Ligand SMILES: *[C@@H]1O[C@H](CO)[C@@H](O[C@@H]2O[C@H](CO)[C@@H](O)[C@H](O)[C@H]2NC(C)=O)[C@H](O)[C@H]1NC(C)=O
Ligand SMILES: *[C@@H]1O[C@H](CO)[C@@H](O)[C@H](O)[C@H]1NC(C)=O
Ligand SMILES: *[C@@H]1O[C@H](CO)[C@@H](O)[C@H](O)[C@H]1NC(C)=O
Ligand SMILES: *[C@@H]1O[C@H](CO)[C@@H](O)[C@H](O)[C@H]1NC(C)=O
């Protein structure tokens with residue numbers, strides 16, 4: 186080898202990578218991509234192969250350092266540890282509630298009110314009951330006989346629709 | 349055990365609800381109990397089965 | 398290099414009670430204040446666990462069948478037990494797993510070792526005697542890790558080899574009992590999940606000599622075997638396993 | 652409600668009609684810190700290489716390999732992947748690599 190050589194006689198360093206895959210567990214992988222953690226939103230989470238959909242909030246549950254996920258009685262993952270920063274997050278299902286329609290007779294009126302059962306009013310004439318969030322009914326301080334039952338001591342009537 | 353009659357009703361209702369949620373973890377002879385695993389692992393002609 | 402040790406005293410191995418030892422965490426899942434039933438490879442409660450001694454002249458290194466899983470208990474002081482040997486034929490015909498902790502660092506190797514009939518370590522009174530294997534031809538896996546390690550230490554280990562995954566569960570307990578296993582509860586945390594993918598049917602533990610012939614330091618270890626069964630595990634408010642129930646021991650626990 | 656009760660007239664009362672579900676807004680795929688990269692610098696940027704009759708072999712295993720710092724490197728005159736697509740190397744997982 187001289188430096189005055191032409192191309193084709195110059196030295197060439199060659200590395201041959203042979204990826205072989207025996208049925209032992211695989212330990213050579215690429216870089217696992219990660220994205221910024223977004224909290225308090227219904228997102229699809231994928232934590233170390235455990236996937237799902239939920240709202241990831243801060244947790245007061247103190248995990249032991251070898252443990253990663255958390256399960257309730259019904260064996261559903263409700264707690265998890267973030268692998269980047271060792272913090273505990275309580276997965277909560279993206280909120281679901283019954284949508285009930287409170288109406289008088291259509292001979293009487295076409296006005297309706299909507300009850301979102303077990304749903305807070307901040308994430309859906311808006312009134313918060315223990316039965317749920319009631320939209321379209323004017324809450325009054327007067328007490329009457331129950332006409333249309335809502336629940337938890339709340340009843341609706343037509344006079345507009347009042348609750 | 350004075351109020352056992354109400355407690356039996358409460359325990360039976362909670363146990364029925366608990367068993368109903370425990371039935372979601374069974375695959376019933378399928379390859380997995382998770383729908384998302386089936387949708388991610390298989391083509392729709394076997395996934396429908 | 399191999400050396401036959403010919404100054405042993407003939408004595409049958411002993412047997413004793415497992416009590417409520419051999420429990421480990423079945424998975425990586427935190428559970429709080431709940432009772433969870435698991436069907437795994439577990440060590441039975443109050444089972445017949447085999448007892449081997451190292452005392453001076455007793456030097457117990459036999460070679461035992463692995464079965465479906467191994468519970469190893471060590472009532473240890475001054476670190477005589479250094480590692481383990483796993484394989485099927487323990488020669489160059491098959492491939493064998495070697496676990497050692499010498500005076501510096503913890504070494505995990507998967508090679509085709511030509512093992513000695515009597516392999517051991519040796520400390521001169523400094524550690525300067527290594528007689529484990531005579532050759533190592535085809536090495537497919539190496540892993541260098543952190544140090545794992547009156548009797549003062551209880552070292553409990555559980556080795557499983559399932560689906561090519563070799564699980565080491567470990568627990569260190571400060572004890573002050575002289576002779577036998579302590580009676581109590583201590584859950585074994587998972588230590589190493591090891592990707593070997595080889596057949597293991599027979600194992601042999603490694604002891605260390607003391608030179609000043611040779612002298613055996615005071616140590617004692619216990620070998621038990623895992624069987625598939627169900628335990629009912631109790632998880633407290635801090636998520637630590639404090640109690641367990643063997644469902645097939647007696648009708649009360651059933 | 653008219654569609655649920657199958658009638659054009661609805662009597663007075665409360666009628667449960669549907670279900671309100673919040674919907675997914677993002678995908679979050681947090682993974683551990685990308686640590687213990689494979690020592691390709693000790694193979695490619697080695698001071699002394701071997702001859703071809705006594706070629707060196709390094710068994711790259713038990714590590715994670717960033718292949719796209721090689722495929723995006725300007726230095727290599729020839730980069731020919733035969734059994735595998737080049738950009739798909741960061742996704743496929745192999746038992747071990749021989750260099
Ligand atoms: C230590 O003792 C063992 C048991 O006898 C020896 O193993 C045998 O060695 C003879 C020597 O030729 C062989 O023919 C046998 O086949 C060996 N047995 C087995 C099961 O392999 C061992 O060699 C002794 N160690 C030393 C250093 O002599
Ligand atoms: C343990 O086994 C030995 C023989 O293997 C037997 O003599 C002994 O009685 C057994 N111990 C118990 C508690 O069953
Ligand atoms: C312990 O074993 C390793 C691997 O064989 C070796 O590198 C190290 O030097 C050994 N330590 C001593 C003190 O011999
Ligand atoms: C194992 O080692 C022997 C001798 O060292 C050699 O002939 C054989 O090819 C090796 N096999 C493998 C798969 O490396």
Ligand SMILES: *[C@@H]1O[C@H](CO)[C@@H](O)[C@H](O)[C@H]1NC(C)=O
Nearest residue numbers: 484485486595596597598599
């Ligand atoms: C493992 O080894 C044992 C005994 O050597 C043998 O009976 C068994 O078939 C082997 N299993 C496999 C999967 O090679």
Ligand SMILES: *[C@@H]1O[C@H](CO)[C@@H](O)[C@H](O)[C@H]1NC(C)=O
Nearest residue numbers: 247632633634635636637639
């Ligand atoms: C749980 O931990 C708290 C402190 O975090 C401690 O006060 C309490 O005693 C612990 N309980 C048990 C059963 O370990």
Ligand SMILES: *[C@@H]1O[C@H](CO)[C@@H](O)[C@H](O)[C@H]1NC(C)=O
Nearest residue numbers: 268269270271683684685686
């Ligand atoms: C990951 O990196 C962050 C910042 O770079 C650090 O705070 C965190 O401790 C790291 N986690 C691990 C497991 O190294």
Ligand SMILES: *[C@@H]1O[C@H](CO)[C@@H](O)[C@H](O)[C@H]1NC(C)=O
Nearest residue numbers: 691692693694695696720724
């Ligand atoms: C060799 O070093 C150069 C400059 O430091 C770098 O750009 C290149 O990626 C290195 N090659 C490797 C790491 O294979």
